């Protein structure tokens, strides 16, 4: 019924039988730049199916005690095949993203997570008079982990979950496009995120357009004898990718 969906992009298809309706940006479906809104003069590269296919990020295990996980996108996909190579070879680029987050469990398991995509998710440092390290902010496809308590270190991210890493209430993250995975309701959630910026195109290494956060508001809980290994896996595909400024690779 409306619980079943299938998405085909490039050479990859994801079929889901128990899912939420698809959340779409701020009501905007991703498109290519118009002549009216353009900067760079060179004819852009449009890899089409070469990069618009789905890629899978490293899976994580959901513990009953887990505080949550996050990824930054332009960085997360930097080694993802040709998407990766096209950003490694260009000064400017643009793409939207389809984010499909999966976590199946038996009917006897309970818990619930927020799946949210947040633009410009600039991070605060655990040490006040300092800035966070590059590896504390992103590890490519490896998720970073939120802390259950206040954390510390000179280049550490203040990862305490309750402030979402940025000094806001975690409970107010629902402003941003989001969807929930409630184990009694569905196995997956889908968010479509258009490119959002102050500029038509940008440098894909210096700036992370958005961060994906997975936050367990209701921790995983189960009876004994039930399966103890319950993974969360994330699969993403760029859309309408465009590149400008072909150059010596970085």
């Amino acid at each position: 019924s409306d619980r079943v969906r299938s998405i085909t992009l490039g050479n990859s298809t994801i079929t889901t039988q128990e899912c939420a309706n698809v959340v779409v940006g701020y009501g905007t479906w991703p498109t290519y730049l118009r002549d009216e809104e353009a900067t760079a003069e060179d004819q852009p590269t449009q890899p089409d199916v070469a990069t618009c296919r789905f890629y899978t990020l490293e899976s994580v295990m959901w513990q009953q005690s887990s505080p949550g996980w996050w990824w930054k996108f332009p960085d997360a996909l930097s080694n993802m095949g040709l998407f990766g190579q096209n950003m490694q070879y260009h000064y400017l680029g643009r793409a939207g993203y389809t984010l499909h987050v999966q976590c199946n469990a038996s009917k006897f398991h309970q818990g619930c997570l927020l799946v949210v995509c947040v633009p410009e998710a600039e991070m605060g440092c655990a040490t006040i008079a300092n800035k966070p390290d590059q590896k504390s902010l992103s590890n490519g496809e490896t998720a970073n982990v939120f802390d259950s308590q206040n954390t510390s270190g000179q280049t550490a991210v203040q990862a305490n979950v309750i402030n979402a890493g940025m000094g806001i209430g975690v409970g107010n993250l629902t402003i941003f496009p989001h969807q929930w995975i409630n184990l009694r309701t569905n196995n997956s959630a889908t968010i479509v995120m258009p490119y959002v910026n102050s500029v038509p195109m940008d440098n894909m290494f210096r700036h992370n357009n958005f961060t994906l956060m997975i936050i367990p508001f209701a921790p995983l809980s189960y009876s004994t004898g039930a399966t103890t290994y319950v993974p969360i896996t994330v699969t993403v595909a760029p859309m309408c990718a465009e590149y400008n400024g072909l150059r010596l690779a970085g």
Partner: protein
């Protein structure tokens, strides 16, 4: 206009329709209104939503910054300077940070006041003071002294004002490099990510310089200038959660971990 939705009368219902139940997991709000849960009367609600508009929320002149300068000092060091930075002020910063991106014109007002310093000098009667405020864009000549040629101001805009007149006022058009000002920047200045990280990488909005344009007088005077900002014609995009932590720095978003609400005795307690 911008009138609040009114209320439609609603009688008893016995049917298969289920406005009461939904799926929050889907990422949208319920559209349920009182007519769907209880019997209602018609209400011609004439209330408007004008104060909720973005323009009204932001168009107030906030104090952003203030500094001081004196009419006496060492080797011409009698001027104040301030790097434009709207993040040094807690209340305005908070309001502005509600939107990720914004495009607006900015109206400025200055309030200039002064006072006497403790002195042993008799005969301090002095003429009315006139002040000069000059804006130097990035890369312009810089004052190093109050009597420097850098104050000639052949191109750089500036304002001269005499005490007792209405406070100075001026309009600044939207000036970004991009199509909006960013409130947040999840990135680095450099490609090797070795420069600073965060919003301050985009802050290259110039500096104000301020001084008296009178000569010195034996009676020492200290002056204070308050700079006020009033955004106009403001269009905003992508709202964000308001901050719960108190601000620590103007150059970043570092924060002290903070709880989400004041506590109470129990979950059923009325005394919050």
């Amino acid at each position: 206009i911008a009138r609040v939705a009114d209320t439609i009368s609603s009688g008893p219902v016995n049917s298969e329709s289920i406005p009461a139940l939904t799926a929050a997991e889907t990422g949208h709000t319920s559209q349920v209104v009182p007519a769907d849960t209880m019997q209602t009367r018609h209400v011609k609600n004439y209330h408007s939503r004008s104060e909720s508009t973005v323009e009204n929320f932001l168009c107030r002149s906030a104090c952003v910054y203030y500094t001081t300068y004196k009419n006496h000092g060492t080797d011409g060091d009698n001027f104040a300077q301030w790097v434009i930075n709207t993040r040094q002020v807690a209340q305005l910063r908070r309001k502005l940070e509600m939107f990720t991106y914004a495009r607006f014109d900015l109206e400025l007002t200055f309030v200039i006041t002064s006072s006497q310093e403790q002195s042993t000098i008799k005969g301090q009667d002095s003429p009315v003071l006139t002040h000069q405020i000059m804006y130097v864009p990035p890369g312009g000549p810089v004052p190093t002294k109050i009597n420097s040629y850098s104050w000639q101001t052949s191109t750089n805009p500036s304002v001269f004002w005499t005490e007792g007149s209405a406070p100075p006022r001026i309009s600044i058009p939207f000036i970004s490099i991009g199509n909006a000002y960013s409130m947040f920047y999840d990135g680095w200045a450099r490609f090797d990510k070795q420069g600073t990280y965060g919003i301050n990488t985009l802050n290259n909005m110039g500096t104000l310089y301020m001084r008296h344009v009178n000569d010195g007088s034996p009676g020492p005077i200290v002056s204070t200038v308050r700079i006020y900002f009033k955004p106009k014609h403001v269009k905003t995009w992508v709202p964000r959660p308001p901050r719960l932590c108190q601000y620590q720095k103007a150059g970043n978003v570092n924060f002290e971990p903070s709880g989400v609400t004041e506590g109470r005795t129990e979950i059923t307690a009325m005394q919050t």
